[PDB]
């Protein structure tokens, strides 16, 4: 028929896909990790936001490092043929390239590897989104006043990592309102998911976290600190949550 363009991901499959939310609040005493007050608000906000985007949401609470790996393995072994995409949200303590299970750390690469183009065939060519609310180190942002050779695709292609903070930095979470990033992400998805492309929505999240939030602490070391999220894209097409 008429001229056809393929610059955007096919999001009109029978299902939008799964949205796995791993909410780790309480950690084993021996790990020495604090309870993540406010993460409950984040998990509920995400569940509602992704439900409205027509995702099959599965909320999992307080999972061990073994349970996280088992869950990710099992989910990657499911038949996603009739699903448009895959979303995984991780809410826990963390360090650079690491997310914490209740009893210990899990390499983010171990989790995401299960969804590689060669390891999860029913998701090949489809967007795989990983939203991570966790620290990526211990740095604090002080802020500032204003020849031709011609059928393969990379195994790391079609992944999007929406990190809550820049590499090497702490990530902030309010005990009453939830995390700065997730609060902003849900607000921007609710307002713009039916209007803007995903990178543009995430850029609005970057602005929201960057401008509307500043830490308050009685400890001078942790007071008046800022945060900027980090969008890491290996996507090959534009992503719209809606379709024609």
């Amino acid at each position: 028929s008429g001229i056809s363009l393929d610059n955007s991901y096919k999001m009109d499959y029978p299902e939008m896909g799964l949205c796995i939310i791993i909410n780790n609040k309480n950690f084993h005493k021996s790990t020495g990790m604090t309870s993540r007050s406010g993460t409950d608000v984040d998990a509920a906000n995400l569940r509602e936001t992704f439900r409205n985007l027509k995702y099959e949401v599965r909320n999992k609470n307080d999972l061990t490092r073994e349970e996280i790996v088992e869950l990710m393995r099992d989910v990657s072994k499911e038949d996603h043929s009739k699903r448009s995409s895959f979303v995984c949200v991780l809410l826990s303590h963390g360090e650079e390239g690491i997310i914490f299970g209740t009893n210990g750390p899990v390499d983010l690469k171990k989790i995401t590897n299960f969804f590689r183009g060669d390891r999860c065939r029913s998701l090949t060519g489809k967007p795989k989104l990983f939203i991570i609310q966790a620290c990526r180190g211990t740095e604090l942002d002080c802020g500032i006043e204003t020849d031709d050779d011609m059928h393969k695709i990379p195994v790391e292609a079609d992944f999007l990592y929406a990190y809550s903070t820049a590499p090497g930095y702490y990530s902030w979470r309010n005990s009453k309102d939830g995390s700065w990033f997730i609060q902003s992400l849900c607000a921007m998805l609710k307002q713009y998911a039916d209007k803007l492309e995903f990178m543009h929505i995430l850029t609005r999240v970057n602005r929201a976290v960057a401008t509307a939030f500043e830490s308050f602490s009685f400890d001078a070391t942790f007071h008046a600190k800022k945060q900027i999220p980090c969008i890491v894209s290996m996507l090959t097409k534009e992503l719209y949550f809606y379709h024609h």
Binding site: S37, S92, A134, S171, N174, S175, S179, F216, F222
Partner: peptide, 4 residues
Amino acid sequence: DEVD
């Protein structure tokens, strides 16, 4: 405000 707390850090993760």
